Amino acid sequence: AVTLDKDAYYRRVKRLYSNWRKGEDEYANVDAIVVSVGVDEEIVYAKSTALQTWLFGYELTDTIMVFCDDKIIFMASKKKVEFLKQIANTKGNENANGAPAITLLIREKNESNKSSFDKMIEAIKESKNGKKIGVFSKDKFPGEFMKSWNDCLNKEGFDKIDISAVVAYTIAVKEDGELNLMKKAASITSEVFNKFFKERVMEIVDADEKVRHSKLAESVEKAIEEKKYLAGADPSTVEMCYPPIIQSGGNYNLKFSVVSDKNHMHFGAITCAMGIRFKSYCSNLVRTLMVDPSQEVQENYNFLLQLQEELLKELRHGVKICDVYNAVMDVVKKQKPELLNKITKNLGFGMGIEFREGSLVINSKNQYKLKKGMVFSINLGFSDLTNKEGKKPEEKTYALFIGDTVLVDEDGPATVLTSVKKKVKNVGIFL
Numbered sequence: 001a002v003t004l005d006k007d008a009y010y011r012r013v014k015r016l017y018s019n020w021r022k023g024e025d026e027y028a029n030v031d032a033i034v035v036s037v038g039v040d041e042e043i044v045y046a047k048s049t050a051l052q053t054w055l056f057g058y059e060l061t062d063t064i065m066v067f068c069d070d071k072i073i074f075m076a077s078k079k080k081v082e083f084l085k086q087i088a089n090t091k092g093n094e095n096a097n098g099a100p101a102i103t104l105l106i107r108e109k110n111e112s113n114k115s116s117f118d119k120m121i122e123a124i125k126e127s128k129n130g131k132k133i134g135v136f137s138k139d140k141f142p143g144e145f146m147k148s149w150n151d152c153l154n155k156e157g158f159d160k161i162d163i164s165a166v167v168a169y170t171i172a173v174k175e176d177g178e179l180n181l182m183k184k185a186a187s188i189t190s191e192v193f194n195k196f197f198k199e200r201v202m203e204i205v206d207a208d209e210k211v212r213h214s215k216l217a218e219s220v221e222k223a224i225e226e227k228k229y230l231a232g233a234d235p236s237t238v239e240m241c242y243p244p245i246i247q248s249g250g251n252y253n254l255k256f257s258v259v260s261d262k263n264h265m266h267f268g269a270i271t272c273a274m275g276i277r278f279k280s281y282c283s284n285l286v287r288t289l290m291v292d293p294s295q296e297v298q299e300n301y302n303f304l305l306q307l308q309e310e311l312l313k314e315l316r317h318g319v320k321i322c323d324v325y326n327a328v329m330d331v332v333k334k335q336k337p338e339l340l341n342k343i344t345k346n347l348g349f350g351m352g353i354e355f356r357e358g359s360l361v362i363n364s365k366n367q368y369k370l371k372k373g374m375v376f377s378i379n380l381g382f383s384d385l386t387n388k389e390g391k392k393p394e395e396k397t398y399a400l401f402i403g404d405t406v407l408v409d410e411d412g413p414a415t416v417l418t419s420v421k422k423k424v425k426n427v428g429i430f431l
Contacts, residue, residue, distance in 0.1 A: 004086040005057050007095055008177070012055055014098030016067070019170045020134075026166040030134035032127040033067040033163065036149060038141025043239075047136035047164050050353040053280050054171050056084075062107060062145040066120045068100065068127035073120050075105040075113075107145065117152040124158065137162040165359035172350055172360065173373040178281060179407065182351075182375050185283035186405040186417035188230060188238060189276040193285055193420050196223045197244075197272065201289055205267050205429055213260035217244040220274060233278065241275035241282050241355045252399035254344055254381040256284075256356065267291040267429070269398035275355070275377075275405075282355045284377035285418050286403030291429045294389055298424050300382060301400050303336060305422060308380050308402055311347060311362075312414040315376065315406070321366035328380075329364075339382055344401075348378040351405070370408050375417070379403035 020027050037048050040061050049059040060083075063076040074084050081104045088102040105116040124133060137160065140146075174182065197220055204211050223229055224238050243259045249266030256273060268291060275284035290297060310331055314324045325347055332340055350360025352375065360368065362376070381401035390396035405417040421427075 009087045010095035017099045026163045031129050032124045033134040036064040038146035039143035045354045046139045048139045053353045071100045073103045132159040134163040135160045168357045168359045181281035185276045185278035189283045189285045190419045192229045210264040213246040217260040220244040239277045241277045245273040247271045249394035250397035254401045266394045271401040283405045286401050315414040317372040342382040344381045348376050351377045374408045378406050
């Protein structure tokens with residue numbers, strides 16, 4: 001039988017209730033929080049399943065959770081219900097005080113679930129003002145169970161309030177156990193880059209091979225099925241956060257939402273983005289490899305490194321994210337104003353069970369304050385740079401992209417969890 005970490009459940013559900021009751025921003029008018037997971041074949045990033053992973057240690061498909069002021073209802077298959085009895089039966093657990101008692105309902109396979117749906121709907125109507133439900137608006141899972149539930153729920157005319165941003169902030173600070181998972185993810189990412197990827201690229205360059213970016217990305221995906229790069233980790237606990245992104249030869253997009261294209265790799269500036277997800281917890285790395293970079297290319301690259309460390313020095317508990325952003329852009333404006341229009345609009349983002357927290361992005365508008373124990377992907381780049389010495393079109397335009405997994409510390413500059421050496425000595429390839 002799979003053990004549920006009960007103490008972690010009670011700590012975290014208490015954090016959720018504390019913030020909900022505090023009633024700031026999107027929490028203010030919410031009468032009940034309603035979270036439902038359908039079929040998930042692709043294991044997509046979603047607040048609904050991230051919340052499950054946070055509370056229970058595991059995603060639970062075809063499962064509904066209703067958080068009310070004085071009760072909590074979980075509805076799932078008999079086997080998942082049996083699993084949840086570990087926290088539903090409290091057995092005098094001291095930690096159980098900060099949240100309501102749990103009622104478990106069984107999802108029937110061969111029978112109508114109307115009776116259970118009605119119980120949850122009545123619980124919502126009875127919770128606080130019984131009018132508005134907190135939801136994750138982006139999440140729509142397929143399958144018959146979600147169809148049936150949504151049909152039932154939609155008849156009731158509850159107002160839906162998106163709570164994605166406030167929940168992101170609620171779960172952002174990592175417990176030590178979670179940080180250990182993210183540290184392991186970061187170390188696996190670093191080992192795959194150091195031992196496999198960088199070597200592979202140097203082989204390709206030394207042999208003057210023509211390799212499509214897409215094919216190189218596939219090779220990296222295959223590499224993490226090999227135990228030699230996992231340092232003891234069960235291979236089934238390791239996944240890519242996203243398909244590895246390799247770009248070169250004047251075609252760059254510096255973001256994590258695009259895949260590697262089919263062009264042959266140019267021995268240029270080669271941007272390489274990859275991250276490992278270990279036991280559902282994400283990490284991220286970006287390195288640019290440079291073949292015979294000129295003095296001017298090196299100058300821009302070293303300035304990029306300078307900006308990153310300036311960012312880490314500013315990313316400290318209590319500081320507003322936008323103020324970190326402005327501090328870094330101030331350095332660009334002062335020292336290299338010509339790069340103001342070349343630099344990435346975002347400098348990084350909060351990272352966790354979900355890879356990229358859209359409300360935690362480091363940009364000019366973000367008002368959220370940093371807290372000790374939050375983890376970020378800190379990413380900075382320059383795009384659309386011109387190489388003067390370039391002749392062919394693939395040589396003329398280059399980009400520079402750097403990123404690391406970092407931890408907001410107790411005091412002082414943020415701590416870097418990834419370990420891949422980034423000096424020109426390390427990422428330069430000289431023919």
